[PDB]
Amino acid sequence: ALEFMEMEKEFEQIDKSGSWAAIYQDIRHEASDFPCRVAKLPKNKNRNRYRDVSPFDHSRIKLHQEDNDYINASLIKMEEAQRSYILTQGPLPNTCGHFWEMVWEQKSRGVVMLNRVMEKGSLKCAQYWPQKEEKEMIFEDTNLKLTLISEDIKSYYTVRQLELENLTTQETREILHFHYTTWPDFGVPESPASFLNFLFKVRESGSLSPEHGPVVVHCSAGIGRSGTFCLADTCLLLMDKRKDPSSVDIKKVLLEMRKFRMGLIQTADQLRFSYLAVIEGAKFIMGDSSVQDQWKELFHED
Template sequence: MNLGVEAEFREIEEKQWSVFFQELDVISNNLPFKHAKLPENKGRNRYREVSPFDHSRVRLQAGTNDYINASLVIIKEARRKYILTQGPLPSTCGHFWQMVWEQRSFGVVMLNRIIELGSVKCTQYWPPSEIKELEFRDTGFKLTLIKEDEKANCIIRHLELENTKTQEARHVIHFHYTAWPDFGPPENPTSFLSFILFVRVSGCLSEDKGPLVVHCSAGIGRSGVFCLVDTCLLLMTTRKDPYSVCVRDVLLEMRKYRMDLVQTPQQLRFAYVAILEGVKPILRSLAIQQSPVMRSLDPFGRMAPKWVHGHHVPFEGVSSWRSQEPMTDSDEEDAPFTFRTSSPPQSPHWL
């Protein structure tokens, strides 16, 4: 298979991932982050060495201090916008939900557990199931747990976020991936790819919604892996030539918006493995479509291309990444991918 990503992967395997990772660090942008180091903002950072760049930091709109450790990452070709942020501190939970409200975000992705290896990685910023409600009086927001759906490798929470000053309320979906091990990345990408698909089919990445909020503990390691895998798989679906996608270039573009995205060589290798597994159904379908009859239909051989919220709907052959029914209601650091869900989809809705 003459696949650019596979060629990249094999070349790096021969070179060693640690060497390749160091080369990436050397050429990654080193942009200013003066606001993060201001005395009044230091207490809002979970880690001293992880700061948002000044040019891409998210600014809080209400209140006397607009600082939050969060970065807006924009990938224009993929038409993707993500907000990557740290796991909230006890003093910044209200700021976190203020940001979600002001940015009109519909979804929050959490890639860590509250406690890992005996250390607190994130404050619980949503209501526990026995309480159902939390109020953040410092920023004027109230959060209510409407529904919690626990799956094998993730928990999907439906929340109501209310602005107590205006009494306006919005629905927010919280996607909590619980299968990332304490040591290193997952052994295989199956559950991670399934989790990305859960997020996609919810509608949270639709262009008519605000940016998807993604966090782990520092907001650079696992968060970077999530955005890199999602973006590369999307580009491989929408480009005329899926072989032209270069993971290295996509990561370097993302690092222009938030420092050190994808934090370790092991995480980067896992991202490549996940992309290679996730793209297999697309390439198998593409190969089928290259017959003389199918080539006459369109550049990808798709029999019935559609667009949903600005994204291509793959044709029926893309089984593992086929459209799904929308669901209604400091980071630590390969098996074939088969997507399965406990609830089979009813109708197409690729995002």
């Protein structure tokens, strides 16, 4: 009856010894370092939100425009898990057209937003989507029209249906916007329940299906919260796919992902939270008594 997951035993040992900072720093020491020459070009200075957060040249997403193909976004391709994600920074006042151009060109079905437009009294990203059905947005620079079709506000997240039209061809597509609205201004969530439920909602939408382009995920820099979302998702998927689930090593998965975008998971607390999310998510998926009750009731409805 009683059996701890291997990462559960690891988690307890790290927690008991108070070594999250040491564990996290080792991951930082071992992380890949690749050039980001395009990102650093003078003409792209206003396309980057932070000088210290850039996409590697080898995995960056290229816009299909002869002028400037640059956008601060990276393709994270997880072979084994058979999952792909585009991690990007929150759009800037001048990169909203590029953002939606990327969504269009990459054939993405979903956009996952993990920050609020304003946090800690500052703007974390531009208001890049329409807030009223009757007030659509037109991005002149990339010739795209974006319309709010519907929106459903829940206590921990909001899901919006958006229609994106390429004005050049008049083709239209429906994009689902999954907005996690409750990550605290400081630190990480006390419990991974709502974040996990949110991940399950994005999964259920079909947005992560290999039949669509990669889901686009962003927070402010596109590495912290965004990194936790993809890391948790990929670890859980691997645990369901492998013959030996206890072989899934979150640290190894995180390093693999860091081969495609720098800085994924920005603090030791975010690492600890990622462990908590995977552990609790794995137990829920495994039909565990405790996790299910406290979930169905409050985590779901109410």
